[PDB]
Design a protein around this ligand. Structure first.
Ligand SMILES: CCCCCCCCCCCCCCCCCC(=O)OC[C@H](COP(=O)([O-])OCC(O)COP(=O)([O-])OC[C@@H](COC(=O)CCCCCCCCCCCCCCCCC)OC(=O)CCCCCCCCCCCCCCCCC)OC(=O)CCCCCCCCCCCCCCCCC
Ligand SMILES: CCCCCCCCCCCCCCCCCC(=O)OCC(COC(=O)CCCCCCCCCCCCCCCCC)OC(=O)CCCCCCCCCCCCCCCCC
Ligand code: HEA
Ligand code: HEA
Ligand SMILES: CCCCC/C=C\C/C=C\C/C=C\C/C=C\CCCC(=O)O[C@H](COC(=O)CCCCCCCCCCCCCCCCC)COP(=O)(O)OCCN
Ligand SMILES: CCCCCC/C=C\CCCCCCCCCC(=O)O[C@H](COC(=O)CCCCCCCCCCCCCCC)COP(=O)(O)OC[C@@H](O)CO
Ligand SMILES: CCCCCC/C=C\CCCCCCCCCC(=O)O[C@H](COC(=O)CCCCCCCCCCCCCCC)COP(=O)(O)OC[C@@H](O)CO
Ligand SMILES: CCCCCC/C=C\CCCCCCCCCC(=O)O[C@H](COC(=O)CCCCCCCCCCCCCCC)COP(=O)(O)OC[C@@H](O)CO
Ligand SMILES: CCCCCCCCCCO[C@@H]1O[C@H](CO)[C@@H](O[C@H]2O[C@H](CO)[C@@H](O)[C@H](O)[C@H]2O)[C@H](O)[C@H]1O
Ligand SMILES: C[C@H](CCC(=O)O)[C@H]1CC[C@H]2[C@@H]3[C@H](O)C[C@@H]4C[C@H](O)CC[C@]4(C)[C@H]3C[C@H](O)[C@]12C
Ligand SMILES: C[C@H](CCC(=O)O)[C@H]1CC[C@H]2[C@@H]3[C@H](O)C[C@@H]4C[C@H](O)CC[C@]4(C)[C@H]3C[C@H](O)[C@]12C
Ligand SMILES: C[C@H](CCC(=O)O)[C@H]1CC[C@H]2[C@@H]3[C@H](O)C[C@@H]4C[C@H](O)CC[C@]4(C)[C@H]3C[C@H](O)[C@]12C
Ligand code: CUA
Ligand SMILES: [Cu+2]
Ligand SMILES: [Mg+2]
Ligand code: NA
Ligand code: NA
Ligand SMILES: [Zn+2]
Lengths: 105, 48, 227, 259, 94, 514, 58, 84
């Protein structure tokens, strides 16, 4: 309804709430993946740091999986997003699903 | 672990690519080593 | 008559039947197109892993998919109704023929001038002459003059029947106590077949109609000889 | 224990005995029409009356005696009765359609005219007009009964309901006499067919409606109704007005316009 | 002659009909005839959901005129949130 | 306890189970009758050597499939199980009258059996037109037993309609408006209104036929000034609403299935779906004489009925496109119920479009009383109703029973049926265009090829029906008990577990107004 | 007449587990058995009549 | 469209009883007069065996099969004419 930038900024603000709770983390990601888009890196960054404040490593990995899933057949999107997130992944010690072997069937 | 018919009114686990963060953990009961692992998770994940 | 493996209508014998063929072609093209478009859209919806499951606003698209079907219906209705009122338009017949349905045969009355009437029964399969058509031939055909507008009046002396000749585009129910009118004009000589078209009991399948279209002078002499 | 206001009904045999009574009445009519025998039909009529008696008895037990008819339950019964009446209206509509079809387009067999050649209709200004005044009057008196009940007046409710019932009986006796005296019969072509089947089903509904009013009369005598809670009475009155309105359409269509 | 003789509901209603009548006079709704009015639904001011047991189904019409109702069991204990709009509900048993 | 529970029931789930059992049994009878039709027609010549029996088989085929299989399954079975659960109600409004709607059906079916056993049967067509159905051309009890079978089925459904309308209007949570109730509930309410208004007219017409046959009335007999065509009007004034009654609950189940296996919380365009069902219901009362275009009707009346009939495509198209829009963006789960629903959308669309062909009265002169009509309605009615029923049955079997089907077997079953019904009915278009009449026990030789294929098709569907019974047996034989069901936040009927307890919603749901 | 509804309310609310169609007492049971006997007996008789009518003697 | 009467203020039992005795029952009494006054048998017409009347396609399931259910020998002829 608003501009892309305004949408992304609402979502960044949502995940950046310092005392965001577990229910709000899940509600956010489960609502976000309903939209026709792959979330911008800046949104995913804010969600991963929410995971960190909630001491939830597993949900951070899961969020990276759902970015890949939302891209569908556009195989170029997920590697781009991981690229943009590598400073955050390194800072927070978040391994990707591929690094964990969780992309094997 | 073990899901019971008599649990139908409680929040449940599901694996659905459109519901990435389910309402409960897959495993709720933790062994001693699994408890220690959840404590370690409170420190830097680079050390996991 | 129909021929083996036929897919569509019998070839037109009358100008109205020719109208119906072109109108059916028009309508079936629309039918094919809509069916194919739905099948295709179904497959398009079902062939992507991309998702969008949040609420979708409907009012904009519902305009398209009410207005476009309404336009299509009007494109069918206009030629449909034109043919309907053509078929109805006055034509001044030269001849009136009655047919009465019965269990299980047709009788025919040609009483414009003389008292001519006779019964018309299916030829039993065991008595077909070689080359004749099973369940379609009759003993006494409905001889009629070709290239002339004929009024057929249809009734019944027992249960409902229905007098049909597909290649002339004709089907008029035969109702006791009622005299239904239809008109008939064959562009060609020949033999044109139909079958009883309202269930009338145990030999409904076995009371066919055979029109024999010939030049007027042959029809006149035939008529005289049938008195 | 429930915390909604609706009625969970005890398991009951009457649906089954009612369904079987329907089997016995219909197979009984078949036996009567084709095998010259009334036996099955009499059993079916008997089991049908027993079913209706015990079923509606139980509804009174559930409501007056056990208290299950909360306002939500009563509201459902109001809808149910209105819908039942609508279905009966459409049943009569089929017979009016038959009557107008045949009378607006009289066929040659009739003489091409309506009334048919050889049919001498009743004079609509004699007993038919009297029957009209009787049912209209009964619609006034049942309205008096209804207001007396709402105002808590036992004696005048009973008096008005008795007058209403007496008028229903008067109509029925008059109609029976008219049937006997009529010079035409049900076998007198489509005139007799439409006349007797349509007025005949109407007369059956008058008898049904009168029976229902009589049930209400005896329940009133037994103090079942309160000044605010009396849906059986309301339902009987709605049904009674339906019977009155169907009569007015019959009178105008078949007796007057069709004469 | 305006006489009497017809029982009133006060006199003669019985059973559940009488329970509903008596509770209505007290402004109470133990048999759920009325729609409850929402609170603001915050964690501080949750919708209070009466129950005679330790769980009850909530339907949440998240926004006025939504045709989709969101259904879930509400259990005794800490307030729970509608999975669609987040508004809070707390069970008040027994 | 057994008799109390199953003969004296006042429970909407148990009565729904009774209806599903009754409808499944009737479906076997109806299928066997359909195989006899197609065996008679599977090669030229005569198989039964008795066309009165042929006509009896055809007639009973239709009555069984319509009145004893589709309506009991859709309305009595899915309606009773699902409608109270979908609105959080504790049962139906009239739980004891509901049981009589059920128990009138075995006697109704018994009367129809009786009709076929006495004399030479009612070989009339399911339309039962006079004078063929009158007391000279069908002397004896068969047609009267048929009339009485319809009377009992009619009372059954009228009282059921009263029950459903009352339940749906009166027993929702107080906060839930009609525009907060699920589409399947809407579809049942609208079907019930159609039943309420249409069946009394049929009852009137068949009662007039009964009195013409037995009391010397002449409603339909020209000798008394009557008219066979009046019966046709009364019959089809019911019979067109009836075909919408047969599909509307199907539309409702399709909406739920498509929504569910698309992973959606709601169907696309809910108010448009309500509008479309109401519009279809209303227009369904003003089109009946398109069953009568060859009876001798004035041209202006033909023009009106042509036009009014075509308009029904507009709301129907909104439903078809909204189902497509529900799939759009879905997380598609390729469950067997989804396959049934997708097959429904396509085959219903084909049959609806041949119905638009037939609505053109000029073309209907040549197509009326031919196999083109038979092909139209076995797409839109026979496949439409059967595919929605199978979709609903596969989808909700775990709710009703507590057990899961084998999904692989269920997908095999779908595949076999889809091939079978298309092989059976698609060639009947060619037979109709080329002039083969319906209600025939044999055909001119030219028509052999397509009748042969059609009959071979009918045996493939027979194999599917046999496999269906084995699949239900295997589920109850293996006893895989349901654990979790997704999307319960938008499918309230699942939220009390599988199967739900005998009493549900003893404490009603909490829904506030805000 | 006197209003004896309270008495009937006591009777039909007695905590005796009886279903409402039997809760009036022994007479209910008699009328129930008569009805059900007529229905089941009549239904058997109708099946006999179908059997008879299913075969030629017309 | 409300007749020439005219008496509300809060409708009630008293007004509907007034209507019952002051209008409804007097009307019945008047129509009862008018009827049982135009009564007395009329001249039954010549019998003509019209084929659209006295229909018999199947015997009636009572009596001798040839008498309608409320047959009145004075005014209802059989297909062969009036009875003795
Ligand atoms: C072992 C016996 C087996 C016998 C089998 C044989 C039977 C065949 C007949 C079947 C009838 C079943 C009735 C069984 C009653 C047993 C009672 C014990 O006690 P309280 O405060 O405790 O009491 C209050 C009282 C409730 O208050 C009452 O007292 C209710 C009063 C009921 C009045 C019923 C009136 C029927 C009136 C007909 C008059 C018609 C007039 C039409 C216009 C006039 C035309 C001239 O509570 C109730 O009793 C509930 C009553 C049930 C209410 C619903 C009943 C409606 C049912 C209608 C079915 C009958 C249809 C007849 C109508 C159609 C044809 C006329 C007690 O008290 C009342 C008992 C009286 C019941 C009478 C039922 C109708 C009688 C019918 C006459 C029969 C005609 C024969 C036809 C046969 C076909 C072949
Ligand atoms: C539609 C349901 C599924 C169908 C399943 C079977 C598929 C059938 C085709 C699947 C393709 C569908 C159309 C096939 C028409 C083939 C013949 C024709 O052109 O017929 C035209 C007329 C006759 O007109 C004429 O006078 C011209 C005759 C020309 C003769 C030339 C020689 C042709 C050789 C013989 C052909 C053998 C026929 C096959 C015999 C078929 C036996 C089963 O017939 C007719 O009207 C038939 C009336 C059918 C109306 C229902 C519409 C269904 C639409 C389905 C579209 C979805 C996309 C397809 C994609 C569909 C895939 C799902
Ligand atoms: C499920 C049952 C069902 C349904 C829903 C329908 C739906 C329709 N039917 Fe059919 N019909 C029958 C069951 C049904 N019918 C039966 C049993 C008979 C014969 C009875 C007998 O004689 O025994 C019959 C007979 C029958 C006749 C009489 C034919 C004859 O006997 O000569 C006609 C004539 O107009 C007709 C027309 C239609 C039309 C226009 C619809 C419409 O409602 C269809 C609307 C649907 C669509 C059009 C497809 C989806 C729409 C879009 C994708 C939008 C875009 C489309 C366009 C612009 C056209 N039907
Ligand atoms: C719901 C309705 C319904 C259903 C499901 C069916 C299903 C089938 N019908 Fe049906 N049929 C009618 C309604 C239905 N029919 C009607 C109304 C007529 C007109 C009767 C008349 O002319 O009076 C008719 C007429 C009709 C004829 C024309 C007979 C004639 O004109 O002489 C044929 C011929 O092939 C046919 C065959 C089939 C077949 C092979 C199936 C099936 O075997 C296809 C597979 C489906 C199943 C196996 C069902 C399984 C479900 C539960 C077990 N039917
Ligand atoms: C005070 C007015 C009378 C009240 C009612 C009297 C009896 C009617 C019974 C109810 C049935 C109503 C309609 C039945 C059809 C015919 C009855 C019409 C009314 C009537 O009573 O008609 C009489 C003939 O009755 C006859 O044939 C035969 C009468 C007996 C046979 C009844 C046949 C049963 C028909 C079954 C109906 C099925 C209904 C199904 C509804 C299902 C709805 C979902 C007329 O007598 P007549 O000697 O011809 O002429 C008078 C000459 N002096
Ligand atoms: C909403 C109304 C808008 C108008 C729509 C058209 C309805 C018209 C009825 C007109 C009847 C008179 C026709 C001219 C004479 C003539 C036959 O006429 C006949 O019987 C006709 C007999 C009646 C046929 C009725 C067909 C429709 C039936 C609908 C049923 C409605 C029931 C409503 C409940 C009270 C043939 O020649
Ligand atoms: C061959 C002959 C066969 C046919 C013979 C038919 C004979 C006659 C049947 C006459 C109908 C009698 C109906 C009596 C119903 C009594 C039960 C009753 O009236 O029950 C009431 C509920 O209404 C309710 O169910 C309302 C239920 C009413 C339904 C009745 C509608 C009439 C149906 C008749 C059948 C139609 C046949 C049509 C044929 C074409 C009880 O609630 P209340 O009154 O509020 O009381 C409670 C207060 O006391 C608390 O203070
Ligand atoms: C050819 C001859 C064929 C003969 C066929 C005969 C067929 C059937 C035999 C009928 C046996 C009837 C037995 C009595 C049925 C009474 C039903 C009734 O009265 O049903 C009521 C609901 O219907 C309501 O109100 C409103 C509805 C009342 C309907 C009463 C019964 C009508 C039966 C005939 C209807 C025909 C329709 C005619 C128009 C086409 C009460 O519902 P329950 O669930 O019981 O209780 C609910 C509790 O809360 C009550 O305390
Ligand atoms: C399931 C419903 C059954 C269909 C009903 C068909 C009608 C049957 C009535 C027949 O009754 C038979 O009639 C015969 C001649 O009168 C008797 O000799 C015979 O003893 C009797 O039994
Ligand atoms: C007004 C009503 C309800 C809206 C609501 O309160 O939510 C809506 C629901 C369905 C709508 C209709 C359907 O979408 C179908 C038609 C679509 C056309 O674009 C306008 C007319 C059209 C006939 C619509 C008129 C109107 O907007 C309707 C009738
Ligand atoms: C079909 C029915 C007559 C049934 C009968 O013969 O009993 C008649 C009665 C009223 C008719 C309608 C009314 O005459 C009004 C319209 C007149 C128009 O010329 C045709 C459509 C039109 C809408 C008619 C269609 C049809 O002929 C109707 C509905
Ligand atoms: C006995 C009873 C008194 C009230 C009560 O029981 O306390 C009275 C009051 C109203 C009376 C009825 C009404 O006056 C109406 C009827 C009048 C008739 O003249 C006698 C019977 C009739 C049906 C009366 C019978 C009986 O005397 C009733 C029923
Ligand atoms: Cu004659 Cu069919
Ligand atoms: Cu139709
Ligand atoms: Mg026909
Ligand atoms: Na009142
Ligand atoms: Na054959
Ligand atoms: Zn919410």
């Amino acid at each position: 309804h608003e501009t892309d930038e305004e949408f992304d900024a609402r979502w960044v603000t949502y995940f950046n709430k310092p005392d965001i709770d577990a229910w709000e983390l899940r509600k956010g990601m489960n609502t976000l993946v309903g939209y026709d888009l792959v979330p911008e890196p800046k949104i995913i960054d804010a969600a991963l740091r929410a995971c960190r404040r909630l001491n939830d490593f597993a949900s951070a990995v899961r969020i990276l999986e759902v970015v890949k899933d939302k891209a569908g057949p556009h195989k170029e999107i997920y590697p781009y997003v991981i690229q943009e997130l590598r400073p955050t992944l390194n800072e927070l010690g978040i391994s990707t699903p591929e690094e964990l072997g969780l992309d094997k069937v | 672990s073990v899901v019971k018919s008599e649990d139908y009114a409680l929040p449940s686990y599901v694996d659905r690519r459109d519901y990435p963060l389910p309402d409960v953990a897959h495993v709720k009961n933790l062994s001693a080593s699994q408890k220690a692992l959840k404590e370690k998770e409170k420190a830097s994940w680079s050390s996991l | 008559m129909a021929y083996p493996m036929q897919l569509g209508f019998q070839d037109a014998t009358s100008p109205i039947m020719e109208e119906l063929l072109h109108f059916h072609d028009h309508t079936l093209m629309i039918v094919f197109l809509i069916s194919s478009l739905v099948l295709y859209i179904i497959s398009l919806m079902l062939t992507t892993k991309l998702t969008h499951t949040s609420t979708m606003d409907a009012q904009e698209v519902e305009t398209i998919w009410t207005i476009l079907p309404a336009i299509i219906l009007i494109l069918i209705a206009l030629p449909s109704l034109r043919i309907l009122y053509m078929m109805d338009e006055i034509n001044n017949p030269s001849l009136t023929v009655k047919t009465m349905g019965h269990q299980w045969y047709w009788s025919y009355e040609y009483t414009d001038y003389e008292d001519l009437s006779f019964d018309s029964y299916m030829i039993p399969t065991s008595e077909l002459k070689p080359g004749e058509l099973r369940l379609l031939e009759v003993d006494n055909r409905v001889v009629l003059p070709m290239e002339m507008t004929i009024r057929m009046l249809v009734s019944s002396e027992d249960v409902l029947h229905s007098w049909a000749v597909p290649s002339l585009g004709l089907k008029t129910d035969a109702i006791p106590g009622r005299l239904n009118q239809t008109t008939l004009m064959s562009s060609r000589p020949g033999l044109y077949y139909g079958q009883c078209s309202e269930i009338c009991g145990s030999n409904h399948s076995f009371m066919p109609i055979v029109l024999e279209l010939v030049p007027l002078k042959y029809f006149e002499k035939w008529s005289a000889s049938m008195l | 224990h429930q915390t909604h206001a609706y009625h969970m009904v005890n398991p009951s045999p009457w649906p089954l005995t009612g369904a079987l009574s329907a089997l016995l009445m219909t197979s009984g009519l078949t036996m009567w029409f084709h095998f010259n025998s009334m036996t099955l039909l009499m059993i079916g009529l008997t089991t049908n009356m027993l079913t209706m008696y015990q079923w509606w008895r139980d509804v009174i037990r559930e409501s007056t005696f056990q208290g299950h008819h909360t306002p939500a339950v009563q509201k459902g019964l109001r809808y149910g009765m209105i819908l039942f009446i609508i279905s009966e209206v459409l049943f009569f509509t089929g017979f009016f359609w038959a009557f107008y079809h045949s009378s607006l387009a009289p066929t040659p067999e009739l003489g091409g005219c309506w009334p048919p050649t050889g049919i001498h209709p009743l004079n609509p200004l004699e007993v038919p007009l009297l029957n009209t005044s009787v049912l209209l009057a009964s619609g006034v008196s049942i309205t008096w009964a209804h207001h007396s009940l709402m105002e808590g007046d036992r004696k005048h409710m009973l008096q008005a309901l008795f007058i209403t019932i007496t008028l229903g009986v008067y109509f029925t006796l008059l109609q029976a006499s008219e049937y006997y005296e009529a010079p035409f019969t049900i076998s007198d072509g489509v005139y007799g067919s439409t006349f007797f089947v349509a007025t005949g089903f109407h007369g059956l509904h008058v008898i049904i409606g009168s029976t229902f009013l009589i049930v209400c009369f005896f329940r009133q005598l037994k103090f079942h109704f309160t000044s605010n809670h009396h849906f059986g009475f309301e339902a009987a009155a709605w049904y009674w007005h339906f019977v009155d309105v169907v009569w007015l359409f019959l009178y105008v269509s078949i007796y007057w316009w069709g004469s | 002659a305006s006489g009497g003789g017809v029982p009133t509901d006060e006199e003669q209603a019985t059973g559940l009909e009488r329970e509903v009548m008596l509770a209505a006079r007290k402004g109470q709704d133990p048999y759920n005839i009325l729609a409850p009015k929402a609170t603001s639904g915050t964690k501080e001011d949750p919708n209070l959901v009466p129950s005679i047991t330790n769980k009850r189904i909530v339907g949440c019409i998240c926004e006025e005129d939504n045709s989709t109702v969101i259904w879930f069991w509400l259990h005794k204990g800490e307030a729970q949130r509608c999975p669609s709009c987040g508004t809070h509900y707390k069970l008040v048993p027994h | 306890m057994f008799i109390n529970r199953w003969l004296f029931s006042t429970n909407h789930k148990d009565i729904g189970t009774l209806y599903l059992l009754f409808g499944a049994w009737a479906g076997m009878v109806g299928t066997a009758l359909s195989l006899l039709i197609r065996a008679e027609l599977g090669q030229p010549g005569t198989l039964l050597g008795d066309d009165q029996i042929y006509n009896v088989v055809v007639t009973a085929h239709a009555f069984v499939m319509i009145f004893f299989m589709v309506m009991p399954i859709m309305i009595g079975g899915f309606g009773n199980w699902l409608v109270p659960l979908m609105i959080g109600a504790p049962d139906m409004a009239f739980p004891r009258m509901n049981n009589m709607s059920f128990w009138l059906l075995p006697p109704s079916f018994l009367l129809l059996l009786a009709s076929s056993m006495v004399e030479a049967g009612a070989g009339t067509g399911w339309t039962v037109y006079p004078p063929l159905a009158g007391n000279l051309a069908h002397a004896g009890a068969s047609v009267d037993l048929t009339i009485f079978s319809l009377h009992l089925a009619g009372v059954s459904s009228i009282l059921g309609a009263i029950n459903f309308i009352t339940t749906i209007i009166n027993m929702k949570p107080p906060a839930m408006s009609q525009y907060q109730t699920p589409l399947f509930v809407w579809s049942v309410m609208i079907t019930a209104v159609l039943l309420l208004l249409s069946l009394p007219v049929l009852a009137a017409g068949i009662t007039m036929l009964l009195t013409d046959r037995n009391l010397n009335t002449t409603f339909f007999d020209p000798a008394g000034g009557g008219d066979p065509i009046l019966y046709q009007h009364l019959f089809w004034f019911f019979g067109h609403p009836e075909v919408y009654i047969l599909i509307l609950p199907g539309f409702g189940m399709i909406s739920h299935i498509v929504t569910y296996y698309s992973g959606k919380k709601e169907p696309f365009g809910y108010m448009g779906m309500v509008w479309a069902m109401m519009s279809i219901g209303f227009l369904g009362f003003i089109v009946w004489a398109h069953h009568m275009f060859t009876v001798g009707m004035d041209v202006d009346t033909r023009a009106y009925f042509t036009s009014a009939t075509m308009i029904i495509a507009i709301p129907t198209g909104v439903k078809v496109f909204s189902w497509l829009a529900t799939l759009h963006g879905g997380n598609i789960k390729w469950s067997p119920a989804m396959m049934w629903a997708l097959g429904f959308i396509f085959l219903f669309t084909v049959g609806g479009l041949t119905g638009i062909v037939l609505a053109n009265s000029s073309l209907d002169i040549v197509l009326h009383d031919t196999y083109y009509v038979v092909a139209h309605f076995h797409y839109v009615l026979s496949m439409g109703a059967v595919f929605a029923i199978m979709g609903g049955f596969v989808h909700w079997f775990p709710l009703f029973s507590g057990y899961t089907l084998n999904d692989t077997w269920a997908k095999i079953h779908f595949a076999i049926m889809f091939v079978g019904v298309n092989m059976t009915f698609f060639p009947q278009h060619f037979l109709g265009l080329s002039g083969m009449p319906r209600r025939y026990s044999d055909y001119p030789d030219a028509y052999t090829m397509w009748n042969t294929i059609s009959s071979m098709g009918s045996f493939i569907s027979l194999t599917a029906v046999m496999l269906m019974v084995f699949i239900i047996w295997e589920a109850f034989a293996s006893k895989r008990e349901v654990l979790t069901v997704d999307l319960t936040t938008t499918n309230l009927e699942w939220l009390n577990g599988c199967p739900p307890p005998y009493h549900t919603f003893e404490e009603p749901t909490y829904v506030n107004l805000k | 007449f006197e209003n004896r509804v309270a008495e009937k309310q006591k009777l039909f609310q007695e905590d005796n587990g009886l279903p409402v169609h039997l809760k009036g007492g022994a007479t209910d049971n008699i009328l129930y058995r008569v009805t059900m006997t007529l229905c089941l007996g009549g239904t058997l008789y109708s099946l006999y009549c179908l059997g008879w009518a299913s075969f030629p003697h017309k | 469209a409300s007749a020439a009467k005219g008496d509300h203020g809060g409708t009630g039992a008293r007004t509907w009883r007034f209507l019952t005795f002051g209008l409804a029952l007097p009307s019945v009494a008047l129509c009862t007069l008018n009827s049982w006054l135009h009564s007395g048998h009329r001249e039954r017409p010549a019998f003509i065996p019209y084929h659209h009347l006295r229909i018999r396609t199947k015997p009636f399931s009572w009596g001798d099969g040839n008498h309608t259910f409320f047959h009145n020998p004075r005014v209802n002829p059989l297909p062969t004419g009036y009875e003795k």
